Amino acid sequence: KEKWGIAHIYSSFNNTIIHITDITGAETISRWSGGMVVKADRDEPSPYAAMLAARRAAEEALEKGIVGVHIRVRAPGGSKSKTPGPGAQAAIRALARAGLKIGRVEDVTPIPHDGTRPKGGRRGRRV
RNA sequence: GCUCGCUGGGGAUACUGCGGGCCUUGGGACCGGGAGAGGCCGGGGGUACCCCCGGGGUAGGGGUGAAAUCCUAUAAUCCCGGG
């Protein structure tokens, strides 16, 4: 009789998304992102915005009855960056603090086995 | 002395040339156990990515030094079941 779900965190260099679903992941419970909390695009990937979005999502999950969550951190992966953005550990800490028990913590970034060609050309970004 | 040479003869046989004989060291042929992303053909997989369908879920998503073009209410970003 324990309510355990899964908290998927999408962390990038432009935004952070916190999405709380059931144990099977087929039932959305709460979904919050930085852009729905902060007013500026530059502030979207900030750890403060991640913490606020995580707090709102945790409050919604607690209201709906979820008491524990399994963390699933994810960078964009694929041909894009494979490292999580700044607002991932902050979101995890906010989830732990807001009143949700924390279970397994794993990284589920999609790692290609020599997949598609990344964008930017053979010379990359030249800034 | 020079005309950078030609020609009639005699002698020598070390080297080169030519003819003959005998060798294996260089190079080839063959056998043995192994090494290697060497090449061609055939059959099975690996995640990743894109698109389509169904379920969940609402308002943003992406992107940059900052933005904007762009996608999104015909239900987007995100999660799950399939092709």
Side-chain angles (χ1 to χ4, degrees):
Chain A
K1 276 229 147 273
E2 271 277 50
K3 297 292 173 70
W4 278 86
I6 302 173
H8 321 262
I9 302 165
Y10 182 101
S11 192
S12 93
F13 296 131
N14 288 322
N15 193 352
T16 310
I17 301 173
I18 298 101
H19 187 185
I20 288 157
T21 67
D22 73 296
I23 191 66
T24 58
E27 214 71 63
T28 293
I29 295 165
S30 158
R31 184 221 295 130
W32 282 76
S33 50
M36 296 169 351
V37 178
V38 284
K39 46 207 270 214
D41 308 353
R42 31 169 305 286
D43 211 345
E44 289 185 25
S46 63
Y48 174 82
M51 260 154 34
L52 294 197
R55 199 204 306 288
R56 297 299 284 285
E59 286 164 11
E60 262 209 56
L62 284 166
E63 193 224 11
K64 293 209 175 179
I66 295 295
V67 306
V69 293
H70 299 262
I71 307 294
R72 266 184 209 181
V73 192
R74 151 196 173 74
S79 86
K80 285 146 165 218
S81 186
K82 271 150 220 58
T83 65
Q89 291 306 324
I92 296 163
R93 265 193 259 92
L95 252 52
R97 156 165 326 269
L100 276 163
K101 302 166 67 153
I102 305 303
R104 279 175 293 147
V105 185
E106 322 169 14
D107 197 291
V108 290
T109 309
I111 301 297
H113 291 183
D114 219 40
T116 52
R117 164 181 280 251
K119 85 165 46 83
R122 67 168 325 215
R123 283 195 289 165
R125 287 183 89 251
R126 306 178 292 281
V127 300

